[PDB]
Amino acid sequence: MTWYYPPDIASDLQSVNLPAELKGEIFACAWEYTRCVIPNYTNWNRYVAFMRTIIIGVIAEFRGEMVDVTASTSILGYDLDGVLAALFEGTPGHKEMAREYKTFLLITADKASERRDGELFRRYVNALAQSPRHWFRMRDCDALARFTIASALACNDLDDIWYTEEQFEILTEIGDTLYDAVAFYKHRAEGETNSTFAYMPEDLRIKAYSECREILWALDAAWARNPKLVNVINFLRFFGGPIHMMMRRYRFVEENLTIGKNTQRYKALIGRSEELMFPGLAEFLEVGGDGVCDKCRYRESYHQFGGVELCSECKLSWRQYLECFVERAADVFPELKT
């Protein structure tokens, strides 16, 4: 396996002590993922900037101690605010997407370090189980799903396209449900905190893929004749499982071409929430951080999922929320009712 990627990023990470071999695999992952889920572009500078947000994120996912968004320094030799400005300067969601990405670095770096055992990560894992709507919003930011919808419009110079909050919530729910359904087994093997069907009932995993895919086709059909909006649908379609066959990050080939097998720091970051946290996350962490249910089983710190275990009365509410996805979709996207 040779690692192929544009030379623009081939001398990235000069300040960073990792094997050249590993820099290679990281650069390739950012290229592969960018080309899979933003398969069209008009703006090379934004494309590469997006690639650089994936380079930092890949590193954060497996060596949290190397990435500290709180230090407000160079991150891995990159000036993060300026990379974020190259990407989104003059798009509707610049400031909010800079928050989305910093939240992703903060949480992913904590999860992939000692700091996993700290207050921020405990509050976050607990806050995931607050509610099914809360789950999908945090999972959105963990997967950079609305960040990548914003990035796909930006990289095609669509600086005038945007969505309501509820519209982002439906689009990312479709994307994340589709991915999380295909990535189930892989996520379990890893002991993930962040996988839809650690929380959502396993017996709905096939039905929920099917429903999401179908709605996606329905919105796609409704958006016909506007080729700009194809960049949003393509993100979700290509992210929602297909990347498992396409990216060397995954083991389709290896598996013989088959699919299916310190409370101060918290309070300081909460005070920096306008900088570091997506709109609403600080509230999510204050309300859900300690658990919201007496029967749900929390751990004192964080071939099985590593998160909160929902009690069976909570799981019904999760089941029921999944089961009214079509109505919740048609609701924010009236064009589906037609």
Annotated binding site for Zn(2+): 293, 296, 311, 314
Query: CB burial class (10 A; 0-12, 13-18, 19+) of residue 109?
Result: buried
Rounded-to-integer distance, Cα 54 and Cα 134, Å: 24
- Of 38-46, 50-58, 291-299, 314-322, which segment contacts ligand FPS by CB under 6 A? 50-58
Binding partner of 314, given ligand FPS, Zn ion, its own copies, none, CB within 5-8 angstroms per partner class: Zn ion
Phi, psi angles (nearest 5°) of residue 298: -95, 150
144 versus 158: smaller Cβ distance to ligand FPS: 144
Contact 232, 34 (CB under 8 A): no
- Which parts of 127-146 interact with ligand FPS (CB under 6 A)? 142-144
Residue type, 326: V
Rounded-to-integer distance, Cα 41 and Cα 155, Å: 5
What are 283's two structure tokens? 């509230």
10 versus 316: smaller Cβ distance to its own copies: 10
Q: Mask of contacts with ligand FPS, 195-234, x by CB under 6 A?
A: ----------------------------------------
Q: Which residues are registered as beta bridge partners of 78?
A: 75
Residue type, 248: R
Applying CB under 8 A, the residues found at the interface with its own copies are: 1-2, 4-8, 28, 31-32, 35-36, 39-42, 44, 181-182, 184, 205-206, 209-210, 213-214, 217-218, 220-221, 224-225, 227, 230, 233-234, 237-238, 241-242, 245-246, 248, 252-253, 255-260
Contact 38, 231 (CB under 8 A): yes
30 versus 66: smaller Cβ distance to its own copies: 30
What are 77's two structure tokens? 């030799």
Q: Mask of contacts with ligand FPS, 5-44, x by CB under 6 A?
A: ------------------------x---x-----------
Rounded-to-integer distance, Cα 73 and Cα 69, Å: 8
47 versus 121: smaller Cβ distance to its own copies: 47
Rounded-to-integer distance, Cα 32 and Cα 53, Å: 13
- Of 6-14, 55-63, 72-80, 161-169, which segment contacts ligand FPS by CB under 6 A? 55-63
Binding partner of 260, given its own copies, ligand FPS, Zn ion, none, CB within 5-8 angstroms per partner class: its own copies
Among 25, 61, 169, 220, binds ligand FPS (CB under 6 A): 61
User: 101: closest CA among 236, 275, 231, 267?
Assistant: 275
114 versus 203: smaller Cβ distance to its own copies: 203
User: From the CB of 75, what's the least distance to its own copies, in Å?
Assistant: 24
Q: Which residues are registered as beta bridge partners of 90?
A: none
Q: Which residues contact 21 (CB under 8 A, 6 or more apart)?
A: none
